[PDB]
Protein backbone atom coordinates (compact mmCIF):
# COMPACT_ATOMS: atom_id res chain seq x y z
CA UNK A 1 0.00 0.00 0.00
CA UNK A 2 1.34 3.39 -1.08
CA UNK A 3 1.24 7.01 0.05
CA UNK A 4 1.71 9.61 -2.70
CA UNK A 5 5.39 10.70 -2.41
CA UNK A 6 5.73 13.82 -0.28
CA UNK A 7 4.83 16.98 -2.19
CA UNK A 8 6.48 20.18 -1.02
CA UNK A 9 5.88 23.78 -2.05
CA UNK A 10 7.53 25.21 -5.16
CA UNK A 11 10.11 28.04 -4.67
CA UNK A 12 7.47 30.50 -5.94
CA UNK A 13 4.99 29.23 -3.33
CA UNK A 14 7.60 29.48 -0.56
CA UNK A 15 8.49 33.02 -1.70
CA UNK A 16 4.79 33.98 -1.71
CA UNK A 17 4.32 32.52 1.78
CA UNK A 18 7.31 34.45 3.17
CA UNK A 19 6.30 37.71 1.46
CA UNK A 20 2.57 37.71 2.24
CA UNK A 21 2.64 35.59 5.41
CA UNK A 22 -0.01 33.21 4.04
CA UNK A 23 -0.65 30.82 1.15
CA UNK A 24 -3.65 28.78 -0.04
CA UNK A 25 -3.35 25.32 -1.57
CA UNK A 26 -6.69 24.39 -3.15
CA UNK A 27 -8.28 20.94 -2.98
CA UNK A 28 -5.71 19.21 -0.75
CA UNK A 29 -8.34 16.92 0.79
CA UNK A 30 -11.27 15.35 -1.08
CA UNK A 31 -14.96 15.48 -0.10
CA UNK A 32 -14.91 12.09 1.62
CA UNK A 33 -11.82 13.04 3.65
CA UNK A 34 -13.40 16.35 4.68
CA UNK A 35 -16.62 14.59 5.69
CA UNK A 36 -14.60 12.28 7.98
CA UNK A 37 -13.00 15.35 9.59
CA UNK A 38 -16.35 17.14 9.93
CA UNK A 39 -17.90 14.12 11.66
CA UNK A 40 -14.93 13.87 14.04
CA UNK A 41 -15.15 17.62 14.75
CA UNK A 42 -18.80 17.13 15.74
CA UNK A 43 -17.75 14.34 18.13
CA UNK A 44 -15.11 16.61 19.67
CA UNK A 45 -17.67 19.40 20.13
CA UNK A 46 -19.91 16.90 21.95
CA UNK A 47 -17.20 15.22 24.07
CA UNK A 48 -14.68 18.04 24.59
CA UNK A 49 -15.87 19.20 28.04
CA UNK A 50 -13.60 21.98 29.34
CA UNK A 51 -11.79 22.07 25.97
CA UNK A 52 -14.92 23.47 24.27
CA UNK A 53 -15.66 27.18 23.90
CA UNK A 54 -19.38 28.05 23.83
CA UNK A 55 -21.34 31.18 22.88
CA UNK A 56 -23.81 27.01 21.25
CA UNK A 57 -20.46 25.31 20.63
CA UNK A 58 -18.07 27.75 18.93
CA UNK A 59 -14.76 25.87 19.04
CA UNK A 60 -12.64 23.17 20.70
CA UNK A 61 -8.91 22.93 21.51
CA UNK A 62 -6.43 20.07 21.68
CA UNK A 63 -8.27 17.37 19.71
CA UNK A 64 -5.10 15.73 18.34
CA UNK A 65 -4.35 14.60 21.92
CA UNK A 66 -7.78 12.95 22.37
CA UNK A 67 -8.88 11.85 18.87
CA UNK A 68 -7.08 9.12 16.91
CA UNK A 69 -8.32 10.68 13.65
CA UNK A 70 -6.93 14.13 14.49
CA UNK A 71 -3.74 12.54 15.86
CA UNK A 72 -3.21 10.98 12.42
CA UNK A 73 -4.23 14.16 10.57
CA UNK A 74 -1.36 16.21 12.03
CA UNK A 75 1.07 13.56 10.65
CA UNK A 76 -0.57 13.64 7.20
CA UNK A 77 1.82 13.47 4.19
CA UNK A 78 -0.25 16.40 2.81
CA UNK A 79 0.73 18.60 5.79
CA UNK A 80 3.81 17.49 7.71
CA UNK A 81 6.36 17.79 4.81
CA UNK A 82 5.29 21.38 4.10
CA UNK A 83 5.44 22.36 7.80
CA UNK A 84 8.97 20.89 7.94
CA UNK A 85 9.86 22.72 4.74
CA UNK A 86 8.59 26.15 5.81
CA UNK A 87 9.95 26.01 9.38
CA UNK A 88 13.19 24.37 8.13
CA UNK A 89 13.15 21.94 11.05
CA UNK A 90 11.48 18.94 12.54
CA UNK A 91 8.11 20.10 13.88
CA UNK A 92 5.51 19.29 16.54
CA UNK A 93 1.95 20.53 17.19
CA UNK A 94 1.88 23.53 19.54
CA UNK A 95 -1.88 24.02 19.32
CA UNK A 96 -4.88 22.42 17.63
CA UNK A 97 -8.29 24.07 17.35
CA UNK A 98 -11.53 23.75 15.43
CA UNK A 99 -13.37 27.02 14.76
CA UNK A 100 -16.98 26.54 13.63
CA UNK A 101 -18.77 29.60 12.29
CA UNK A 102 -22.30 28.43 11.58
CA UNK A 103 -24.63 29.84 8.92
CA UNK A 104 -26.02 33.23 9.99
CA UNK A 105 -23.90 33.15 13.18
CA UNK A 106 -20.56 34.36 14.54
CA UNK A 107 -19.05 37.44 16.19
CA UNK A 108 -16.41 39.96 15.16
CA UNK A 109 -12.93 38.63 15.86
CA UNK A 110 -10.54 41.43 16.87
CA UNK A 111 -7.21 41.99 15.11
CA UNK A 112 -4.47 39.91 16.71
CA UNK A 113 -1.20 38.06 16.17
CA UNK A 114 -1.10 34.48 17.47
CA UNK A 115 2.60 34.84 18.29
CA UNK A 116 1.85 37.59 20.83
CA UNK A 117 -0.20 35.04 22.80
CA UNK A 118 2.27 32.17 22.36
CA UNK A 119 5.26 34.32 23.31
CA UNK A 120 3.74 35.86 26.45
CA UNK A 121 1.49 32.98 27.58
CA UNK A 122 3.53 29.93 26.61
CA UNK A 123 7.15 31.13 26.36
CA UNK A 124 7.52 30.58 22.60
CA UNK A 125 10.95 32.23 22.02
CA UNK A 126 10.59 33.21 18.33
CA UNK A 127 7.79 33.27 15.68
CA UNK A 128 9.16 30.12 13.99
CA UNK A 129 5.71 28.58 13.77
CA UNK A 130 2.72 28.51 11.44
CA UNK A 131 -0.89 27.37 11.25
CA UNK A 132 -2.51 25.14 8.64
CA UNK A 133 -6.23 25.92 8.36
CA UNK A 134 -8.16 23.13 6.65
CA UNK A 135 -11.34 24.34 4.95
CA UNK A 136 -14.22 22.03 5.95
CA UNK A 137 -16.40 24.28 3.76
CA UNK A 138 -15.84 26.64 0.84
CA UNK A 139 -14.54 29.95 2.20
CA UNK A 140 -16.19 32.96 0.55
CA UNK A 141 -16.51 36.72 0.94
CA UNK A 142 -19.64 36.19 3.04
CA UNK A 143 -19.06 33.34 5.52
CA UNK A 144 -16.59 35.16 7.77
CA UNK A 145 -13.19 34.36 6.14
CA UNK A 146 -9.96 34.84 8.04
CA UNK A 147 -8.75 38.29 6.97
CA UNK A 148 -5.07 39.24 7.01
CA UNK A 149 -2.72 42.17 6.61
CA UNK A 150 -0.39 40.82 3.86
CA UNK A 151 3.25 41.32 4.86
CA UNK A 152 2.04 42.38 8.32
CA UNK A 153 4.14 39.68 10.00
CA UNK A 154 7.36 41.31 8.80
CA UNK A 155 7.76 43.93 11.55
CA UNK A 156 7.57 41.36 14.34
CA UNK A 157 5.33 41.53 17.41
CA UNK A 158 3.07 44.59 17.55
CA UNK A 159 2.55 46.12 21.00
CA UNK A 160 -0.79 44.97 22.45
CA UNK A 161 -2.75 45.86 25.59
CA UNK A 162 -2.96 42.97 28.07
CA UNK A 163 -6.36 42.17 29.58
CA UNK A 164 -5.50 31.62 30.49
CA UNK A 165 -5.52 33.56 27.23
CA UNK A 166 -7.61 32.09 24.43
CA UNK A 167 -8.00 33.43 20.89
CA UNK A 168 -11.50 31.91 20.81
CA UNK A 169 -12.61 34.09 23.76
CA UNK A 170 -14.92 37.06 23.10
CA UNK A 171 -12.50 39.68 24.47
CA UNK A 172 -8.92 38.87 23.42
CA UNK A 173 -6.24 39.28 26.10
CA UNK A 174 -3.88 40.83 23.53
CA UNK A 175 -5.63 42.94 20.88
CA UNK A 176 -4.16 45.54 18.52
CA UNK A 177 -4.95 49.25 18.94
CA UNK A 178 -6.60 51.41 16.27
CA UNK A 179 -3.44 53.47 15.65
CA UNK A 180 -1.18 50.44 15.14
CA UNK A 181 -3.62 48.73 12.76
CA UNK A 182 -4.38 51.93 10.83
CA UNK A 183 -0.70 52.32 9.92
CA UNK A 184 -0.24 48.64 9.02
CA UNK A 185 -3.39 48.55 6.89
CA UNK A 186 -2.63 51.90 5.21
CA UNK A 187 0.76 50.52 4.11
CA UNK A 188 -0.15 46.90 3.37
CA UNK A 189 -3.93 46.64 2.83
CA UNK A 190 -6.16 43.67 3.80
CA UNK A 191 -6.85 40.31 2.11
CA UNK A 192 -9.34 37.51 2.85
CA UNK A 193 -8.01 34.36 1.10
CA UNK A 194 -10.81 32.31 -0.47
CA UNK A 195 -10.88 28.66 -1.48
CA UNK A 196 -12.94 25.49 -2.01
CA UNK A 197 -13.71 22.84 0.58
CA UNK A 198 -10.60 20.76 1.25
CA UNK A 199 -8.16 23.66 0.72
CA UNK A 200 -5.37 24.41 3.20
CA UNK A 201 -4.55 27.97 4.24
CA UNK A 202 -1.01 28.24 5.63
CA UNK A 203 -0.32 31.34 7.72
CA UNK A 204 2.51 32.76 9.80
CA UNK A 205 2.47 32.84 13.61
CA UNK A 206 2.97 36.61 13.49
CA UNK A 207 0.51 37.68 10.78
CA UNK A 208 -2.26 40.06 12.01
CA UNK A 209 -5.70 38.58 11.37
CA UNK A 210 -9.37 39.15 12.09
CA UNK A 211 -12.81 37.97 10.89
CA UNK A 212 -16.49 38.91 10.82
CA UNK A 213 -19.78 36.98 11.31
CA UNK A 214 -21.08 34.53 8.72
CA UNK A 215 -24.07 36.07 6.87
CA UNK A 216 -24.38 33.14 4.47
CA UNK A 217 -26.71 30.10 4.79
CA UNK A 218 -23.60 27.87 4.76
CA UNK A 219 -21.25 26.89 7.60
CA UNK A 220 -17.56 27.82 7.65
CA UNK A 221 -15.69 25.11 9.55
CA UNK A 222 -11.90 25.43 9.97
CA UNK A 223 -9.51 22.91 11.48
CA UNK A 224 -6.38 24.83 12.54
CA UNK A 225 -3.14 22.96 13.22
CA UNK A 226 -0.28 25.06 14.62
CA UNK A 227 3.10 23.51 13.86
CA UNK A 228 6.13 24.77 15.78
CA UNK A 229 9.83 24.21 15.11
CA UNK A 230 11.29 21.68 17.57
CA UNK A 231 14.29 23.99 18.06
CA UNK A 232 11.71 26.71 18.81
CA UNK A 233 9.98 24.62 21.52
CA UNK A 234 8.24 26.70 24.17
CA UNK A 235 9.65 27.27 27.63
CA UNK A 236 7.41 25.08 29.79
CA UNK A 237 8.85 26.96 32.80
CA UNK A 238 7.28 30.24 31.60
CA UNK A 239 4.00 28.60 30.51
CA UNK A 240 1.01 27.83 32.77
CA UNK A 241 -1.70 26.90 30.24
CA UNK A 242 -2.92 23.27 29.95
CA UNK A 243 -1.45 20.87 27.38
CA UNK A 244 -4.55 21.23 25.18
CA UNK A 245 -3.81 24.97 24.72
CA UNK A 246 0.01 24.72 24.60
CA UNK A 247 1.75 21.39 23.98
CA UNK A 248 4.54 20.18 26.28
CA UNK A 249 5.57 17.07 24.29
CA UNK A 250 8.17 18.20 21.75
CA UNK A 251 8.72 14.78 20.15
CA UNK A 252 9.32 15.35 16.39
CA UNK A 253 6.37 14.24 14.26
CA UNK A 254 6.80 11.48 11.68
CA UNK A 255 4.70 11.05 8.55
CA UNK A 256 1.80 8.62 8.33
CA UNK A 257 2.58 5.56 6.19
CA UNK A 258 -0.01 3.57 4.22
CA UNK A 259 -0.77 0.42 6.25
CA UNK A 260 -3.38 -2.36 6.06
CA UNK A 261 -5.45 -0.69 8.81
CL1 LIG B 1 -3.70 30.98 21.95
CSV table of C-alpha atoms and ligand atoms in Angstrom, one decimal:
chain,number,residue,atom,x,y,z
A,1,UNK,CA,0.0,0.0,0.0
A,2,UNK,CA,1.3,3.4,-1.1
A,3,UNK,CA,1.2,7.0,0.1
A,4,UNK,CA,1.7,9.6,-2.7
A,5,UNK,CA,5.4,10.7,-2.4
A,6,UNK,CA,5.7,13.8,-0.3
A,7,UNK,CA,4.8,17.0,-2.2
A,8,UNK,CA,6.5,20.2,-1.0
A,9,UNK,CA,5.9,23.8,-2.0
A,10,UNK,CA,7.5,25.2,-5.2
A,11,UNK,CA,10.1,28.0,-4.7
A,12,UNK,CA,7.5,30.5,-5.9
A,13,UNK,CA,5.0,29.2,-3.3
A,14,UNK,CA,7.6,29.5,-0.6
A,15,UNK,CA,8.5,33.0,-1.7
A,16,UNK,CA,4.8,34.0,-1.7
A,17,UNK,CA,4.3,32.5,1.8
A,18,UNK,CA,7.3,34.4,3.2
A,19,UNK,CA,6.3,37.7,1.5
A,20,UNK,CA,2.6,37.7,2.2
A,21,UNK,CA,2.6,35.6,5.4
A,22,UNK,CA,0.0,33.2,4.0
A,23,UNK,CA,-0.6,30.8,1.1
A,24,UNK,CA,-3.7,28.8,0.0
A,25,UNK,CA,-3.4,25.3,-1.6
A,26,UNK,CA,-6.7,24.4,-3.1
A,27,UNK,CA,-8.3,20.9,-3.0
A,28,UNK,CA,-5.7,19.2,-0.7
A,29,UNK,CA,-8.3,16.9,0.8
A,30,UNK,CA,-11.3,15.4,-1.1
A,31,UNK,CA,-15.0,15.5,-0.1
A,32,UNK,CA,-14.9,12.1,1.6
A,33,UNK,CA,-11.8,13.0,3.7
A,34,UNK,CA,-13.4,16.3,4.7
A,35,UNK,CA,-16.6,14.6,5.7
A,36,UNK,CA,-14.6,12.3,8.0
A,37,UNK,CA,-13.0,15.4,9.6
A,38,UNK,CA,-16.3,17.1,9.9
A,39,UNK,CA,-17.9,14.1,11.7
A,40,UNK,CA,-14.9,13.9,14.0
A,41,UNK,CA,-15.1,17.6,14.8
A,42,UNK,CA,-18.8,17.1,15.7
A,43,UNK,CA,-17.8,14.3,18.1
A,44,UNK,CA,-15.1,16.6,19.7
A,45,UNK,CA,-17.7,19.4,20.1
A,46,UNK,CA,-19.9,16.9,21.9
A,47,UNK,CA,-17.2,15.2,24.1
A,48,UNK,CA,-14.7,18.0,24.6
A,49,UNK,CA,-15.9,19.2,28.0
A,50,UNK,CA,-13.6,22.0,29.3
A,51,UNK,CA,-11.8,22.1,26.0
A,52,UNK,CA,-14.9,23.5,24.3
A,53,UNK,CA,-15.7,27.2,23.9
A,54,UNK,CA,-19.4,28.1,23.8
A,55,UNK,CA,-21.3,31.2,22.9
A,56,UNK,CA,-23.8,27.0,21.2
A,57,UNK,CA,-20.5,25.3,20.6
A,58,UNK,CA,-18.1,27.7,18.9
A,59,UNK,CA,-14.8,25.9,19.0
A,60,UNK,CA,-12.6,23.2,20.7
A,61,UNK,CA,-8.9,22.9,21.5
A,62,UNK,CA,-6.4,20.1,21.7
A,63,UNK,CA,-8.3,17.4,19.7
A,64,UNK,CA,-5.1,15.7,18.3
A,65,UNK,CA,-4.4,14.6,21.9
A,66,UNK,CA,-7.8,13.0,22.4
A,67,UNK,CA,-8.9,11.9,18.9
A,68,UNK,CA,-7.1,9.1,16.9
A,69,UNK,CA,-8.3,10.7,13.6
A,70,UNK,CA,-6.9,14.1,14.5
A,71,UNK,CA,-3.7,12.5,15.9
A,72,UNK,CA,-3.2,11.0,12.4
A,73,UNK,CA,-4.2,14.2,10.6
A,74,UNK,CA,-1.4,16.2,12.0
A,75,UNK,CA,1.1,13.6,10.6
A,76,UNK,CA,-0.6,13.6,7.2
A,77,UNK,CA,1.8,13.5,4.2
A,78,UNK,CA,-0.2,16.4,2.8
A,79,UNK,CA,0.7,18.6,5.8
A,80,UNK,CA,3.8,17.5,7.7
A,81,UNK,CA,6.4,17.8,4.8
A,82,UNK,CA,5.3,21.4,4.1
A,83,UNK,CA,5.4,22.4,7.8
A,84,UNK,CA,9.0,20.9,7.9
A,85,UNK,CA,9.9,22.7,4.7
A,86,UNK,CA,8.6,26.2,5.8
A,87,UNK,CA,10.0,26.0,9.4
A,88,UNK,CA,13.2,24.4,8.1
A,89,UNK,CA,13.1,21.9,11.1
A,90,UNK,CA,11.5,18.9,12.5
A,91,UNK,CA,8.1,20.1,13.9
A,92,UNK,CA,5.5,19.3,16.5
A,93,UNK,CA,2.0,20.5,17.2
A,94,UNK,CA,1.9,23.5,19.5
A,95,UNK,CA,-1.9,24.0,19.3
A,96,UNK,CA,-4.9,22.4,17.6
A,97,UNK,CA,-8.3,24.1,17.3
A,98,UNK,CA,-11.5,23.7,15.4
A,99,UNK,CA,-13.4,27.0,14.8
A,100,UNK,CA,-17.0,26.5,13.6
A,101,UNK,CA,-18.8,29.6,12.3
A,102,UNK,CA,-22.3,28.4,11.6
A,103,UNK,CA,-24.6,29.8,8.9
A,104,UNK,CA,-26.0,33.2,10.0
A,105,UNK,CA,-23.9,33.2,13.2
A,106,UNK,CA,-20.6,34.4,14.5
A,107,UNK,CA,-19.1,37.4,16.2
A,108,UNK,CA,-16.4,40.0,15.2
A,109,UNK,CA,-12.9,38.6,15.9
A,110,UNK,CA,-10.5,41.4,16.9
A,111,UNK,CA,-7.2,42.0,15.1
A,112,UNK,CA,-4.5,39.9,16.7
A,113,UNK,CA,-1.2,38.1,16.2
A,114,UNK,CA,-1.1,34.5,17.5
A,115,UNK,CA,2.6,34.8,18.3
A,116,UNK,CA,1.8,37.6,20.8
A,117,UNK,CA,-0.2,35.0,22.8
A,118,UNK,CA,2.3,32.2,22.4
A,119,UNK,CA,5.3,34.3,23.3
A,120,UNK,CA,3.7,35.9,26.4
A,121,UNK,CA,1.5,33.0,27.6
A,122,UNK,CA,3.5,29.9,26.6
A,123,UNK,CA,7.1,31.1,26.4
A,124,UNK,CA,7.5,30.6,22.6
A,125,UNK,CA,10.9,32.2,22.0
A,126,UNK,CA,10.6,33.2,18.3
A,127,UNK,CA,7.8,33.3,15.7
A,128,UNK,CA,9.2,30.1,14.0
A,129,UNK,CA,5.7,28.6,13.8
A,130,UNK,CA,2.7,28.5,11.4
A,131,UNK,CA,-0.9,27.4,11.2
A,132,UNK,CA,-2.5,25.1,8.6
A,133,UNK,CA,-6.2,25.9,8.4
A,134,UNK,CA,-8.2,23.1,6.6
A,135,UNK,CA,-11.3,24.3,4.9
A,136,UNK,CA,-14.2,22.0,6.0
A,137,UNK,CA,-16.4,24.3,3.8
A,138,UNK,CA,-15.8,26.6,0.8
A,139,UNK,CA,-14.5,30.0,2.2
A,140,UNK,CA,-16.2,33.0,0.5
A,141,UNK,CA,-16.5,36.7,0.9
A,142,UNK,CA,-19.6,36.2,3.0
A,143,UNK,CA,-19.1,33.3,5.5
A,144,UNK,CA,-16.6,35.2,7.8
A,145,UNK,CA,-13.2,34.4,6.1
A,146,UNK,CA,-10.0,34.8,8.0
A,147,UNK,CA,-8.7,38.3,7.0
A,148,UNK,CA,-5.1,39.2,7.0
A,149,UNK,CA,-2.7,42.2,6.6
A,150,UNK,CA,-0.4,40.8,3.9
A,151,UNK,CA,3.2,41.3,4.9
A,152,UNK,CA,2.0,42.4,8.3
A,153,UNK,CA,4.1,39.7,10.0
A,154,UNK,CA,7.4,41.3,8.8
A,155,UNK,CA,7.8,43.9,11.5
A,156,UNK,CA,7.6,41.4,14.3
A,157,UNK,CA,5.3,41.5,17.4
A,158,UNK,CA,3.1,44.6,17.5
A,159,UNK,CA,2.5,46.1,21.0
A,160,UNK,CA,-0.8,45.0,22.4
A,161,UNK,CA,-2.8,45.9,25.6
A,162,UNK,CA,-3.0,43.0,28.1
A,163,UNK,CA,-6.4,42.2,29.6
A,164,UNK,CA,-5.5,31.6,30.5
A,165,UNK,CA,-5.5,33.6,27.2
A,166,UNK,CA,-7.6,32.1,24.4
A,167,UNK,CA,-8.0,33.4,20.9
A,168,UNK,CA,-11.5,31.9,20.8
A,169,UNK,CA,-12.6,34.1,23.8
A,170,UNK,CA,-14.9,37.1,23.1
A,171,UNK,CA,-12.5,39.7,24.5
A,172,UNK,CA,-8.9,38.9,23.4
A,173,UNK,CA,-6.2,39.3,26.1
A,174,UNK,CA,-3.9,40.8,23.5
A,175,UNK,CA,-5.6,42.9,20.9
A,176,UNK,CA,-4.2,45.5,18.5
A,177,UNK,CA,-5.0,49.3,18.9
A,178,UNK,CA,-6.6,51.4,16.3
A,179,UNK,CA,-3.4,53.5,15.7
A,180,UNK,CA,-1.2,50.4,15.1
A,181,UNK,CA,-3.6,48.7,12.8
A,182,UNK,CA,-4.4,51.9,10.8
A,183,UNK,CA,-0.7,52.3,9.9
A,184,UNK,CA,-0.2,48.6,9.0
A,185,UNK,CA,-3.4,48.6,6.9
A,186,UNK,CA,-2.6,51.9,5.2
A,187,UNK,CA,0.8,50.5,4.1
A,188,UNK,CA,-0.1,46.9,3.4
A,189,UNK,CA,-3.9,46.6,2.8
A,190,UNK,CA,-6.2,43.7,3.8
A,191,UNK,CA,-6.9,40.3,2.1
A,192,UNK,CA,-9.3,37.5,2.9
A,193,UNK,CA,-8.0,34.4,1.1
A,194,UNK,CA,-10.8,32.3,-0.5
A,195,UNK,CA,-10.9,28.7,-1.5
A,196,UNK,CA,-12.9,25.5,-2.0
A,197,UNK,CA,-13.7,22.8,0.6
A,198,UNK,CA,-10.6,20.8,1.3
A,199,UNK,CA,-8.2,23.7,0.7
A,200,UNK,CA,-5.4,24.4,3.2
A,201,UNK,CA,-4.6,28.0,4.2
A,202,UNK,CA,-1.0,28.2,5.6
A,203,UNK,CA,-0.3,31.3,7.7
A,204,UNK,CA,2.5,32.8,9.8
A,205,UNK,CA,2.5,32.8,13.6
A,206,UNK,CA,3.0,36.6,13.5
A,207,UNK,CA,0.5,37.7,10.8
A,208,UNK,CA,-2.3,40.1,12.0
A,209,UNK,CA,-5.7,38.6,11.4
A,210,UNK,CA,-9.4,39.1,12.1
A,211,UNK,CA,-12.8,38.0,10.9
A,212,UNK,CA,-16.5,38.9,10.8
A,213,UNK,CA,-19.8,37.0,11.3
A,214,UNK,CA,-21.1,34.5,8.7
A,215,UNK,CA,-24.1,36.1,6.9
A,216,UNK,CA,-24.4,33.1,4.5
A,217,UNK,CA,-26.7,30.1,4.8
A,218,UNK,CA,-23.6,27.9,4.8
A,219,UNK,CA,-21.2,26.9,7.6
A,220,UNK,CA,-17.6,27.8,7.6
A,221,UNK,CA,-15.7,25.1,9.6
A,222,UNK,CA,-11.9,25.4,10.0
A,223,UNK,CA,-9.5,22.9,11.5
A,224,UNK,CA,-6.4,24.8,12.5
A,225,UNK,CA,-3.1,23.0,13.2
A,226,UNK,CA,-0.3,25.1,14.6
A,227,UNK,CA,3.1,23.5,13.9
A,228,UNK,CA,6.1,24.8,15.8
A,229,UNK,CA,9.8,24.2,15.1
A,230,UNK,CA,11.3,21.7,17.6
A,231,UNK,CA,14.3,24.0,18.1
A,232,UNK,CA,11.7,26.7,18.8
A,233,UNK,CA,10.0,24.6,21.5
A,234,UNK,CA,8.2,26.7,24.2
A,235,UNK,CA,9.6,27.3,27.6
A,236,UNK,CA,7.4,25.1,29.8
A,237,UNK,CA,8.9,27.0,32.8
A,238,UNK,CA,7.3,30.2,31.6
A,239,UNK,CA,4.0,28.6,30.5
A,240,UNK,CA,1.0,27.8,32.8
A,241,UNK,CA,-1.7,26.9,30.2
A,242,UNK,CA,-2.9,23.3,30.0
A,243,UNK,CA,-1.4,20.9,27.4
A,244,UNK,CA,-4.5,21.2,25.2
A,245,UNK,CA,-3.8,25.0,24.7
A,246,UNK,CA,0.0,24.7,24.6
A,247,UNK,CA,1.8,21.4,24.0
A,248,UNK,CA,4.5,20.2,26.3
A,249,UNK,CA,5.6,17.1,24.3
A,250,UNK,CA,8.2,18.2,21.7
A,251,UNK,CA,8.7,14.8,20.1
A,252,UNK,CA,9.3,15.3,16.4
A,253,UNK,CA,6.4,14.2,14.3
A,254,UNK,CA,6.8,11.5,11.7
A,255,UNK,CA,4.7,11.1,8.5
A,256,UNK,CA,1.8,8.6,8.3
A,257,UNK,CA,2.6,5.6,6.2
A,258,UNK,CA,0.0,3.6,4.2
A,259,UNK,CA,-0.8,0.4,6.2
A,260,UNK,CA,-3.4,-2.4,6.1
A,261,UNK,CA,-5.5,-0.7,8.8
B,1,LIG,CL1,-3.7,31.0,21.9
